[PDB]
Design a protein around this ligand. Structure first.
Ligand SMILES: *[C@@H]1O[C@H](CO)[C@@H](O[C@@H]2O[C@H](CO)[C@@H](O)[C@H](O)[C@H]2NC(C)=O)[C@H](O)[C@H]1NC(C)=O
Ligand SMILES: *[C@@H]1O[C@H](CO)[C@@H](O[C@@H]2O[C@H](CO)[C@@H](O)[C@H](O)[C@H]2NC(C)=O)[C@H](O)[C@H]1NC(C)=O
Ligand SMILES: OC[C@H]1O[C@@H](O)[C@H](O)[C@@H](O)[C@@H]1O
Ligand code: NA
Length: 755
């Protein structure tokens, strides 16, 4: 087939990783330039894998790396492959967005999967630790297994961590063979997601075989699968806008049986299960001693599906189908008339969860969603390259004025294009309220300098997105924000603009990465941990002040946004060793929004990872946090001074009369102050250490408190999972839900809290 004319195939290639010392390293690889024919009859396996591996990238024997990104582009066509496509560390596999190409498995295909994102060597060891397998894309493909035997075949071995996405993929599999069909679209053994959007699964034994700590996956369609979704294990998983059609089972979450359930929790929102034998198979019963198998249904239709929820241990129909299920919860609930202050295990349908109309799509009544923009219809001439217009991107030159002038000059029908590189910013960049910005394979934008961002007593925004009260369209995609050296006064992004319509103001595949990699000066040599000594809290190891601030009047749509403070060093020489980086605050949301956050994560800040202050109209699904591993050496009262202009938590005061004072002074997972109409559909809020020691895991007591609701907040929490916090949820200083009352298979889990 002809070239599509998609801008990405043609835009001038001027990108280069600033901290790769090879001046000839090529970020962009078109597989046909490596000899792929794309006719569906020539074997293209070698050419595709060569396009990925070229340039001494992070493969076997490489723990991780950030200086060898690649964007591997597949023009329209059909690519016959007979061995796995091995996606090296930090690879974007980008099929043509206008006419997604087919990856066609040969009849005699051999290997784990058509795409393997984490191979196993002959010793059974992964190339990369699954929890460290960050910063990936696979987008715009048809994966066709129908020439393979019905007894074998997997589309993608998707064993990955955060800042990863599958987007716009069709999986075509065989429908014959009965119980002997074993094809599956995704095979996932473990990991720590992550986002998936806009997937279609046709046929196979399993649309997806899933196992992961946590994931957010929305707009998935399953047609004619035996089981659409086999949930092998998890701690939490949020599905939204799932369409299951003519399957035997929709979601199987009964693995392990009633005395060994390995699925922690599942949430299913805004979905439809059609012409399916059993909608959801579960082993949960409210008389069980634990919370494993927690399930939330919210706005799920069950057309032509006679059994909506079945207990497959007893064979008993829990919920009848052929109706709309407004709300269903099984697991433990707190608050309101049902659970109260002590909590109660339930398995019941109940009243609809009414959500503010400003959060909803008016055409569907579902919570509003929008996938990462690829600008299919924008001609290449509308793209304004920052490097063509005076920015150097070399990680040393001050690019502030050039970037500001570009932002001031572009008109709304253009798109600012960040060529790959590292762009040093030394004072506030004012982003206008009508702009579109997209990056070449996660370019770095780094707050640098030696004064402007140095003062935690006088913090300053790095990117100031709109001025207060402005409204328009601001879209950013495929970027990383960080610091060049310590910048403890940097507010990485201050979000003032509001979208003219839902989704018109937002971030997609935009991450904040504080420390840990080449260019930050915050790596193993500077910031290695030392748990045996009282932490000196080196000034050279500070991060930023606050990674994201949605101010009053601001409104944003966030999807696949990882707000990460480095727990360990990422270049291969560091061998994943752990470091101390002191970053004050994660995500702070204020005002009436709305704010949507799909597949966001915020990890390892000192004071809090998410905080809402005087906020309304917040929808997050699902969220994930971690406490920094060095606490409590130092504890959360250091090294950031309490600043009431940000409603900072004051642990010295809040922990004074704590009955668990030894670990009270620890970062909040979620803190809500005077905030209402906040909805959280799925949360994994984890505390894994005390001064790098994990003894506290044995007694689920690495910290005292994890979620705080304060000042008459009204927050709706669904599928709240926490790890090793004595109190899961505290209201006005009073512990409400305790870990010991809600034990799951690893975390503790509350199905439903409403205030
Ligand atoms: C869910 O994702 C699918 C897969 O990307 C979307 O279907 C595509 O929609 C575009 C635009 O309408 C078409 O050009 C493609 O041909 C579609 N592909 C397939 C395989 O159907 C779908 O629009 C998404 N649904 C929602 C509600 O966002
Ligand atoms: C919830 O998960 C826990 C953890 O896996 C289950 O407890 C384990 O059950 C297996 C049997 O399948 C035992 O071999 C382990 O020793 C148990 N571990 C612990 C720490 O108790 C528990 O049975 C599950 N609960 C439900 C109701 O399914
Ligand atoms: O292995 C280290 C990784 O462990 C995971 O649990 C965390 O989510 C990551 O932030 C971290 O870098
Ligand atoms: Na860890």
């Amino acid at each position: 087939q002809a070239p599509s004319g998609w801008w990405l195939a043609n835009i001038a290639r001027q990108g280069r990783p600033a901290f790769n010392p090879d001046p000839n390293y090529k970020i962009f690889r078109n597989v046909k330039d490596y000899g792929a024919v794309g006719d569906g009859v020539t074997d293209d396996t070698a050419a595709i894998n060569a396009a990925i591996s070229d340039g001494n990238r992070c493969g076997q024997g490489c723990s991780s790396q950030t200086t060898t990104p690649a964007l591997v582009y597949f023009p329209p066509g059909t690519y016959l492959v007979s061995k796995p496509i091995i996606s090296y560390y930090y690879t974007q596999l980008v099929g043509d967005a206008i006419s997604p190409p087919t990856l066609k498995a040969a009849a005699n295909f051999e290997g784990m999967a058509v795409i393997d994102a984490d191979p196993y060597d002959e010793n059974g060891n992964n190339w990369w630790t699954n929890q460290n397998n960050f910063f990936r894309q696979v987008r715009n493909f048809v994966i066709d297994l129908t020439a393979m035997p019905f007894e074998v075949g997997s589309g993608i071995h998707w064993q990955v961590a955060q800042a990863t996405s599958l987007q716009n993929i069709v999986f075509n599999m065989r429908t014959d063979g009965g119980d002997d069909n074993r094809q599956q679209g995704i095979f996932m053994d473990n990991g720590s997601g992550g986002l998936m959007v806009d997937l279609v699964f046709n046929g196979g034994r399993y649309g997806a075989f899933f196992g992961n700590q946590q994931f957010t996956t929305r707009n998935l369609t399953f047609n004619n699968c035996k089981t659409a979704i086999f949930m092998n294990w998890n701690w939490a998983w949020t599905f939204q806008d799932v369409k299951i059609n003519n399957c035997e089972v929709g979601i199987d979450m009964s693995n392990g049986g009633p005395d060994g359930q390995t699925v922690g929790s599942v949430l299913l929102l805004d979905s439809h299960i059609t012409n399916t034998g059993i909608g959801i198979k579960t082993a949960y019963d409210p008389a069980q001693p634990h919370t494993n198998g927690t399930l939330i249904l919210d706005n799920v239709e069950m057309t032509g599906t006679p059994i909506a929820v079945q207990n497959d241990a007893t064979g008993t129909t829990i919920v009848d189908g052929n109706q709309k299920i407004a709300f269903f919860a099984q697991g433990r609930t707190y608050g309101g008339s049902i659970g109260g202050t002590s909590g109660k295990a339930v398995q019941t349908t109940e009243q609809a969860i009414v959500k503010p109309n400003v959060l909803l799509d008016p055409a569907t009544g579902k919570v509003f969603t929008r996938s990462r923009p690829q600008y299919e219809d924008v001609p290449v001439s509308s793209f304004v390259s920052v490097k063509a217009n005076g920015a150097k991107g070399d990680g040393v030159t001050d690019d502030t004025d050039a970037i500001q002038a570009i932002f001031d000059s572009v008109t709304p029908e253009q798109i600012v294009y960040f060529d790959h590189g590292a762009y040093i910013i030394t004072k506030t960049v004012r982003v206008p309220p009508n702009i579109r910005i997209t990056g070449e394979a996660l370019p770095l934008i780094l707050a640098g300098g030696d004064s402007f961002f140095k003062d935690q007593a006088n913090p300053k925004p790095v990117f100031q997105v709109g001025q207060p009260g402005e409204r328009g369209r601001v879209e950013m995609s495929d970027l990383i924000f960080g610091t060049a050296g310590p910048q403890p006064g940097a507010i990485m992004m201050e979000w003032n603009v509001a979208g003219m319509e839902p989704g018109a103001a937002g971030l997609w595949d935009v991450h904040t990465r504080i420390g840990g990699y080449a260019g930050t000066q915050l790596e193993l040599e500077q910031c290695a941990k030392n748990p045996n000594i009282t932490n000196p809290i080196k000034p050279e190891c500070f991060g930023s002040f606050l990674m994201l601030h949605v101010t009053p009047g601001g409104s944003a749509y966030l999807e696949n946004t990882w707000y990460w403070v480095a727990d360990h060093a990422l270049e291969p020489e560091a061998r994943d060793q752990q470091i101390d980086v002191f970053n004050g605050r994660g995500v702070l949301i204020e005002g009436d929004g709305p704010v949507w956050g799909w597949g966001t994560s915020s990890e390892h800040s000192v004071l809090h990872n998410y905080q809402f202050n005087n906020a309304r109209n917040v929808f997050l699904a699902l969220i994930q946090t971690e406490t920094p591993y060095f606490q409590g050496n130092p504890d959360a009262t250091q090294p950031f001074t309490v600043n009431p202009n940000f409603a900072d938590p004051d642990f010295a005061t809040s922990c004074t009369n704590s009955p668990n004072p030894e670990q009270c002074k620890r970062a909040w997972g979620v803190r809500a102050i005077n905030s209402t109409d906040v909805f959280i559909y799925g949360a994994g809020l984890y505390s894994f250490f005390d001064n790098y020691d994990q003894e506290c895991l044995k007694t689920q007591s690495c910290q005292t408190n994890m979620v705080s609701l304060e000042g008459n907040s009204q927050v709706h929490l669904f599928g709240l999972s926490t790890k090793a916090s004595v109190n899961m949820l505290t209201v006005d200083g009073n512990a409400v839900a305790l870990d010991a009352d809600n034990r799951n298979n690893f975390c503790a889990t509350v199905a439903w809290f409403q205030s």
